[PDB]
Amino acid sequence: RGSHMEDFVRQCFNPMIVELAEKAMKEYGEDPKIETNKFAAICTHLEVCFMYSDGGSKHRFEIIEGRDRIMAWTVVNSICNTTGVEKPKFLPDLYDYKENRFIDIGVTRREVHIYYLEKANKIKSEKTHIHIFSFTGEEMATKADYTLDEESRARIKTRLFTIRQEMASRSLWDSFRQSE
Ligand SMILES: [Mn+2]
Ligand SMILES: [Mn+2]
């Protein structure tokens, strides 16, 4: 069965992101053709992570998101075993070489703090930095430390709101917002 959402995702995100999202979904045994909202969210999370890592200096970020589970943890161990930083319980998204911390980036259709609090306790990792974006232009980061300058975060919020308008323009936003 062919859904409008899957066709929208494929023509809205670049092929490298879609491929990474598919490999991520099947690696954890899920179908992009059936669980299509999740497909859309994984693509979105991937793009935001990539836009985020583009915000810093050249060597600033190590990218963990978008890798095989095995090599992602391999890089995490290399980072920990060479910076002494604590090994997070669950896979982060980036490591900040400038601020010497892991970052878990979140994208939500709820209020940023409803989402941050749950991400805070689920990790329970005191060290890992959290940065949440919403589809309504809000953000919320650990210690009010937003890592990147304003322009790079504003770029991310703009893109998130364009995705939401594109889904709304195709009547897929309601099903997407309710499915989280
Ligand atoms: Mn991740
Ligand atoms: Mn994340």
From Swiss-Prot:
Residue numbers annotated as active site: 119
Chain location of the short sequence motif Nuclear localization signal 1 (NLS1) per the record: 109-124
Positions contributing to Mn(2+) 1 binding: 45, 65, 93, 104-105
Superkingdom of the source species: Viruses
Effect upon mutating residue 40 to V: Reduced affinity for Baloxavir and Baloxavir marboxil
Impact reported for residue 27 to K: Reduced affinity for Baloxavir and Baloxavir marboxil
Subcellular location(s) of the protein: Host cytoplasm; Host nucleus
UniProt binding sites for Mn(2+) 2: 65, 93
Sections of the chain in a coiled coil: none
PTM note: Phosphorylated on serines and threonines by host kinases, including human casein kinase II.
Effect of residue 42 to T: RO-7 resistant, reduced affinity for Baloxavir and Baloxavir marboxil
Function: Plays an essential role in viral RNA transcription and replication by forming the heterotrimeric polymerase complex together with PB1 and PB2 subunits. The complex transcribes viral mRNAs by using a unique mechanism called cap-snatching. It consists in the hijacking and cleavage of host capped pre-mRNAs. These short capped RNAs are then used as primers for viral mRNAs. The PB2 subunit is responsible for the binding of the 5' cap of cellular pre-mRNAs which are subsequently cleaved after 10-13 nucleotides by the PA subunit that carries the endonuclease activity.
Assembly with partners or alone: Influenza RNA polymerase is composed of three subunits: PB1, PB2 and PA. Interacts (via C-terminus) with PB1 (via N-terminus).
Sequence similarity: Belongs to the influenza viruses PA family.
Protein name: Polymerase acidic protein
Originating species: Influenza A virus (strain swl A/California/04/2009 H1N1)
Gene: PA
Parent sequence residues shown: 1 to 195 of 716
